[PDB]
Amino acid sequence: QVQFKLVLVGDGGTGKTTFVKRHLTGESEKKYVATLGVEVHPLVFHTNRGPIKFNVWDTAGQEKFGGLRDGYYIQAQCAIIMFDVTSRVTYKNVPNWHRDLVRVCENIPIVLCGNKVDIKDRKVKAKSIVFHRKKNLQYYDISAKSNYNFEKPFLWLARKLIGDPNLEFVAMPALAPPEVVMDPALAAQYEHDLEVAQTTA
């Protein structure tokens, strides 16, 4: 079986828990790791190369009070770093998370996600999002509550880890229905801004 430990980090309140919980089977089959206060969510995705499982490590909030213990990071094979696009400070803390992660895990594949893009009053915009370009990281706007771009971080990571640029998901996993609407007009614009910013340097 093909599985990877995926550590999910970022400032408290960025929506890491909401995000991982979108995946319904991941939620029903999650395992509690008492020693570390961690819930591990097995997220299966079906690709043209077979099933791939991301065991996503989600905190129980300890990140609000300081860095995470080494055991949390140990043996991680990939990661997502999340910040809140409606909170400049969460973006500002991103470098710290990268540092801590990399001190333990090194050059593992990492996706940077700006969450909560369903919100009209957006603080951290595409042209300000620059950390990923510096460190080799891929970026995606996401909205956990609307399922927007939910699958993109996992697809990029699967491609990187298997070493197959043509890897595809045969179908989307069963997800919790969108709690908020992600405006299609918005999603169109936010995608344009990102593209342009990526060609800005």
Partner: peptide
Amino acid sequence: GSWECPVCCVSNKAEDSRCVSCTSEKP
């Protein structure tokens, strides 16, 4: 000799009498 941890699913070596990540015993 490697074993998967029943508690957190991390793959460990046989030389480890408990999980490098969560410290859980090897079955």
